[PDB]
Amino acid sequence: TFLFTSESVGEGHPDKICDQISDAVLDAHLQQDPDAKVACETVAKTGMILLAGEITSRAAVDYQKVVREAVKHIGYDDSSKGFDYKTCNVLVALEQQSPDIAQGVHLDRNEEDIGAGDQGLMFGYATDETEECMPLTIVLAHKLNAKLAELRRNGTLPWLRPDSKTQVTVQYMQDRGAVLPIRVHTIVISVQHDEEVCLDEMRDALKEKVIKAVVPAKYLDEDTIYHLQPSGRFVIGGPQGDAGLTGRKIIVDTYGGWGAHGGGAFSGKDYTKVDRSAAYAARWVAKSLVKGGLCRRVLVQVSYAIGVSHPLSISIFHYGTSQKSERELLEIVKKNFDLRPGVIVRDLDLKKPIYQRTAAYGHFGRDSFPWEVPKKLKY
Amino acid sequence: TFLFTSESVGEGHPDKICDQISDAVLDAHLQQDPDAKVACETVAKTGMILLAGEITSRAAVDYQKVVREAVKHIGYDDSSKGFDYKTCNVLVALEQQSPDIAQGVHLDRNEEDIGAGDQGLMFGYATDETEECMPLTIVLAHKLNAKLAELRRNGTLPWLRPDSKTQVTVQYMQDRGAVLPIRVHTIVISVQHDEEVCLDEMRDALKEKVIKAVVPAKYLDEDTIYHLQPSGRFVIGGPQGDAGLTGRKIIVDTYGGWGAHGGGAFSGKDYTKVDRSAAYAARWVAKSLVKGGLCRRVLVQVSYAIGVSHPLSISIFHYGTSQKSERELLEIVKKNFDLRPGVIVRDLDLKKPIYQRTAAYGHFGRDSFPWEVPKKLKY
Ligand SMILES: C[S@@+](CC[C@H](N)C(=O)[O-])C[C@H]1O[C@@H](n2cnc3c(N)ncnc32)[C@H](O)[C@@H]1O
Ligand SMILES: C[S@@+](CC[C@H](N)C(=O)[O-])C[C@H]1O[C@@H](n2cnc3c(N)ncnc32)[C@H](O)[C@@H]1O
Ligand SMILES: [K+]
Numbered sequence: 183t184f185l186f187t188s189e190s191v192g193e194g195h196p197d198k199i200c201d202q203i204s205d206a207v208l209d210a211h212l213q214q215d216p217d218a219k220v221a222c223e224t225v226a227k228t229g230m231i232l233l234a235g236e237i238t239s240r241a242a243v244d245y246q247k248v249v250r251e252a253v254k255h256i257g258y259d260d261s262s263k264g265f266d267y268k269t270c271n272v273l274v275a276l277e278q279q280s281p282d283i284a285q286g287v288h289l290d291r292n293e294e295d296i297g298a299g300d301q302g303l304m305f306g307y308a309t310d311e312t313e314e315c316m317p318l319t320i321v322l323a324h325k326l327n328a329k330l331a332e333l334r335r336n337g338t339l340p341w342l343r344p345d346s347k348t349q350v351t352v353q354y355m356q357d358r359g360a361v362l363p364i365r366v367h368t369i370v371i372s373v374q375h376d377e378e379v380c381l382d383e384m385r386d387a388l389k390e391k392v393i394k395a396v397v398p399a400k401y402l403d404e405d406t407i408y409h410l411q412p413s414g415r416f417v418i419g420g421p422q423g424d425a426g427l428t429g430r431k432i433i434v435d436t437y438g439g440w441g442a443h444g445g446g447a448f449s450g451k452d453y454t455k456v457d458r459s460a461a462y463a464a465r466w467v468a469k470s471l472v473k474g475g476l477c478r479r480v481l482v483q484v485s486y487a488i489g490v491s492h493p494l495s496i497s498i499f500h501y502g503t504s505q506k507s508e509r510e511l512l513e514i515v516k517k518n519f520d521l522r523p524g525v526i527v528r529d530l531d532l533k534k535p536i537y538q539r540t541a542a543y544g545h546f547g548r549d550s551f552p553w554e555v556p557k558k559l560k561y
Numbered sequence: 562t563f564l565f566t567s568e569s570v571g572e573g574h575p576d577k578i579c580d581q582i583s584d585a586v587l588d589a590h591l592q593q594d595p596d597a598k599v600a601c602e603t604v605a606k607t608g609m610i611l612l613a614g615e616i617t618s619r620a621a622v623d624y625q626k627v628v629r630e631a632v633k634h635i636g637y638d639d640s641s642k643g644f645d646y647k648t649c650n651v652l653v654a655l656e657q658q659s660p661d662i663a664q665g666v667h668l669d670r671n672e673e674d675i676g677a678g679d680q681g682l683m684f685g686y687a688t689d690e691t692e693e694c695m696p697l698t699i700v701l702a703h704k705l706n707a708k709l710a711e712l713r714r715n716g717t718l719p720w721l722r723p724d725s726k727t728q729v730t731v732q733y734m735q736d737r738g739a740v741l742p743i744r745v746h747t748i749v750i751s752v753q754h755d756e757e758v759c760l761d762e763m764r765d766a767l768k769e770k771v772i773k774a775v776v777p778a779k780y781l782d783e784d785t786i787y788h789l790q791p792s793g794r795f796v797i798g799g800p801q802g803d804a805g806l807t808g809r810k811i812i813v814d815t816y817g818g819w820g821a822h823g824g825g826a827f828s829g830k831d832y833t834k835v836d837r838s839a840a841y842a843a844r845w846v847a848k849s850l851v852k853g854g855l856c857r858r859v860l861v862q863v864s865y866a867i868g869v870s871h872p873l874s875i876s877i878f879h880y881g882t883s884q885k886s887e888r889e890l891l892e893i894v895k896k897n898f899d900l901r902p903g904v905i906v907r908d909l910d911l912k913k914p915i916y917q918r919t920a921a922y923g924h925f926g927r928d929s930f931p932w933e934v935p936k937k938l939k940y
């Protein structure tokens with residue numbers, strides 16, 4: 183057996199605030215101009231949200247309203263919680279997209295033949311260990327943060343504040359390249375709280391009302407290690423406790439350390455940025471291979487050069503979980519998918535303003551987004 | 562055979578500027594106070610460097626001088642290049658480290674027993690495909706950017722500006738889990754340039770003076786694909802062309818997509834932040850296993866909880882490249898290394914102000930930093 187650990191963070195973790203704001207800006211632009219070019223970074227620290235980056239769009243967007251409404255949704259609505267959407271500073275340093283990039287990527291190009299918005303590499307991954315084809319470690323870690331937000335928002339644990347982190351270590355066995363979860367070895371939960379609640383009341387609630395509500399009992403046993411509020415005190419939180427930036431939770435956004443990552447952030451970027459569109463397409467290819475019965479676990483790499491539509495490379499790694507060779511699976515992928523960004527946008531409907539919904543609790547394995555609906559493969 | 566692609570970026574890429582500034586700030590603090598607690602994020606956009614984060618230190622640091630001297634070293638010294646250290650804005654939004662974090666991590670603790678500064682997961686990787694135990698893809702990509710900076714700085718290609726990106730695709734064969742590079746399949750180079758030089762002069766120089774100077778001729782052939790200045794024009798660059806943030810090149814900083822990554826950035830953080838110290842220690846463990854003759858290729862995962870000194874989990878994956886089981890290699894690691902941050906700091910000398918040197922061209926595989934010198938193993 184072996185251990186593997188993944189983490190997740192809540193909606194009010196300062197980096198995740200930034201990813202949600204960046205995607206609220208992108209959605210505000212796409213609601214008016216489906217062809218907006220957006221590269222919006224967000225920085226958060228005590229009292230401040232700064233927007234920086236490049237946007238060329240026909241939309242008229244009220245940045246103060248978009249930013250403040252996203253922070254209000256997260257739950258930072260009073261100085262007692264360390265941040266307040268009503269009274270924080272919002273600073274904007276947004277300029278047009280560089281004309282040199284625009285001319286090299288999309289200007290005067292037919293949409294299917296638009297060039298990749300940048301160079302880079304991206305990976306897709308899928309594993310049959312869960313129905314949603316995601317690692318159990320990260321699924322559990324995300325659901326523990328979702329449960330904390332539910333209990334905060336329904337008033338069950340009114341001492342909870344929006345900033346949280348979780349981490350799950352699962353003990354696995356291997357089976358011919360596929361992985362089989364056996365038990366939960368360790369869980370960590372840290373969550374911002376009010377000044378009145380004591381450590382013992384929080385530790386008891388985190389075990390009884392959060393962990394037992396999320397983790398199947400079969401995975402928990404007498405030896406499971408719990409680190410609940412391990413720092414001992416977490417009253418200061420959100421951007422006051424730790425600066426946040428967009429694109430600083432890229433492993434939380436994807437596979438929790440499993441598979442691989444090419445380094446590109448997702449949030450704040452329109453479809454021409456292949457860091458997002460091609461990673462979404464690669465997840466769609468990986469999940470299509472697993473739900474199609476071709477492998478039990480698979481990693482897909484793709485890469486691009488700025489201004490060039492077709493990927494430079496495509497690679498498939500099946501961990502030994504298919505009777506077909508990796509070259510055969512590559513040929514099936516090449517016959518069934520077109521991974522130009524200007525075709526991915528049509529297959530995955532990537533001009534639709536649903537990106538803020540992807541910016542917490544992972545981009546993959548939930549809510550039947552287009553990249554989660556397998557493509558029936560012909561071979 | 563299969564393809565694999567990795568990228569790198571130059572010193573003047575806007576994200577890399579931020580990592581170098583964050584580490585210049587950390588070094589300035591450590592020069593005066595070896596025990597400084599530093600979590601410095603940097604944001605860059607047209608005309609601006611913003612510092613945000615938390616620092617508790619006894620040092621007296623002139624942030625305007627530190628920031629401007631780092632930008633001067635990178636080479637942004639005139640408005641014609643799109644950024645100038647003499648005249649840009651430097652904004653500081655730095656506060657003390659949260660007292661709640663300080664009390665839960667290090668306050669009143671014996672140094673060897675300091676808790677991890679945060680939770681998280683980290684990986685180390687090593688491969689025998691190169692003497693420095695790094696993937697050839699990323700080594701080549703880094704050296705192509707280093708060669709562009711050398712030719713810019715020696716006046717050979719005076720039209721070059723500091724912002725660059727490269728990407729290398731290598732065609733490999735597998736050998737019992739180990740990987741063997743066969744040839745370079747594709748190279749991309751994009752680099753900011755002056756308004757006078759034409760595309761053909763730049764493409765010819767990039768092939769003849771950069772690629773041929775860096776890539777062994779045995780790997781290049783008649784079928785090697787070159788995408789040199791593929792956007793066609795890159796005069797606007799640096800932070801004017803694209804906002805930069807610290808910790809947005811975490812795959813460039815590590816293994817180029819090989820191995821795995823736990824998501825944590827390195828730059829701007831002191832040793833108590835296990836995202837940096839434990840990733841460095843994990844690279845040291847991986848390279849020690851490969852140089853010790855125990856495996857040909859290996860991935861090491863570790864994880865931590867905030868306030869807890871010992872790792873929560875340790876895992877070793879050898880890809881089938883050892884006669885010893887992964888459990889045996891884990892036992893050898895556990896007998897030879899102590900992965901508490903307050904012991905890693907002593908083994909790797911992590912209070913020394915050498916971090917700006919790590920913040921471009923990768924943290925691993927070069928210049929015999931302590932984590933690159935193997936530990937002789939007893940078993
Ligand atoms: C510990 S901080 C990162 C290190 C920090 N920048 C410093 O100055 O030491 C990382 C994340 O952990 C969580 N956090 C903040 N304060 C915490 C505390 N007192 N205990 C536990 N977790 C905390 C928040 O989710 C925060 O965004
Ligand atoms: C293309 S930009 C990222 C997308 C961008 N934020 C936008 O608004 O479309 C990414 C990086 O590529 C490089 N770059 C900038 N302008 C470029 C151009 N005209 N051609 C090629 N590469 C460029 C720089 O290294 C830059 O930091
Ligand atoms: K990726």
Ligand SMILES: [K+]
Pocket residue numbers: 424425426600602614
């Ligand atoms: K931070």
Ligand SMILES: [K+]
Pocket residue numbers: 682683684685821822823824825840
């Ligand atoms: K890592």
Ligand SMILES: [K+]
Pocket residue numbers: 221223235803804805
């Ligand atoms: K950017």
Ligand SMILES: [Mg+2]
Pocket residue numbers: 197425426427430
């Ligand atoms: Mg962070």
Ligand SMILES: [Mg+2]
Pocket residue numbers: 300301302445446457
């Ligand atoms: Mg990138």
Ligand SMILES: [Mg+2]
Pocket residue numbers: 576804805806809
């Ligand atoms: Mg970037």
Ligand SMILES: [Mg+2]
Pocket residue numbers: 679680681824825836
């Ligand atoms: Mg982290």
